[PDB]
């Protein structure tokens, strides 16, 4: 099934949070996402340092390291430039808190999250299909805020 | 310029190699390419063990890492099946040894140049540019027999 809302995933967010940081331990993460891939349920954790960015896939569900990617930053990225990007991921809700707050403000089947900063927030990206459409619900993190519901 | 007989690397082929199989000790190569990108020339070291597969890119000059990159195998080449596709490295000619050979049996220019292997036999495959059209030349890597030419 494709209902992230009907899922377990025995290894929680946090714990693909530390599996990267144990791994990078002077990267910043400046994206997070669990989608499902075939088969599995994947969380993709992004990051990036003064000289590289950093990708690291981790099934949801075994803890297995699918991909782990490093990649050196482009010029423009350099010397800390893509760590601004960071995101801000103490004392935030959980994903199923952001998940349920984006279904009742748009009923249908979650299909993805992610967590991802603009303009100094930190916000789930909740997506929702129902019928024809596809809905990005930003939530704010700490707050729980519905900050926009985009149709794509 | 996009001669790669015109250009020096002061980054043997075997050293990329080496830098290869000293981060992967377990791995075997698989497939080893030499090309431009953009302002760059990059030494692209593909591997595998029992379980991943592993990409690196050199800089040809600097001995900069720019790729470093292990994803999980498919299903249908783990335990030690991918590695049937190694390449066999040890006394074989020069890349520009094969150059050579293979400008001889077509003039141009080399644009790229890699070592696969196909029915266990490992062979240099020359890229060359000539008028409207691109060749490429199979070298075998040990005795210099030009061993196919197609046009691309
Ligand atoms: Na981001
Ligand atoms: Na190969």
Tied chains: 1, 2.
Excluded: H
């Amino acid at each position: 099934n494709e209902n992230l809302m009907e899922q377990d995933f025995k290894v929680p967010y946090t714990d693909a949070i530390n599996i990267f940081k144990d791994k990078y331990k002077d990267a910043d993460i400046v994206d997070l996402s669990l989608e499902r891939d075939l088969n599995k349920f994947v969380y993709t954790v992004e990051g990036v340092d003064d000289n590289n960015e950093y990708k690291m896939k981790i099934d949801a569900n075994t803890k297995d390291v699918l991909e782990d990617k490093t990649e050196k930053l482009d010029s423009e990225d350099l010397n800390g430039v893509a760590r601004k990007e960071k995101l801000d991921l103490n004392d935030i809700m959980t994903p199923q808190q952001a998940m349920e707050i984006a279904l009742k403000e748009q009923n249908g089947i979650v299909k993805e999250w992610s967590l991802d900063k603009d303009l100094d927030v930190t916000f789930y990206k909740i997506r929702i299909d129902k019928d024809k459409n596809e809905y990005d619900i930003k939530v704010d993190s700490k707050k729980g805020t519905v900050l926009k519901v985009e149709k794509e």
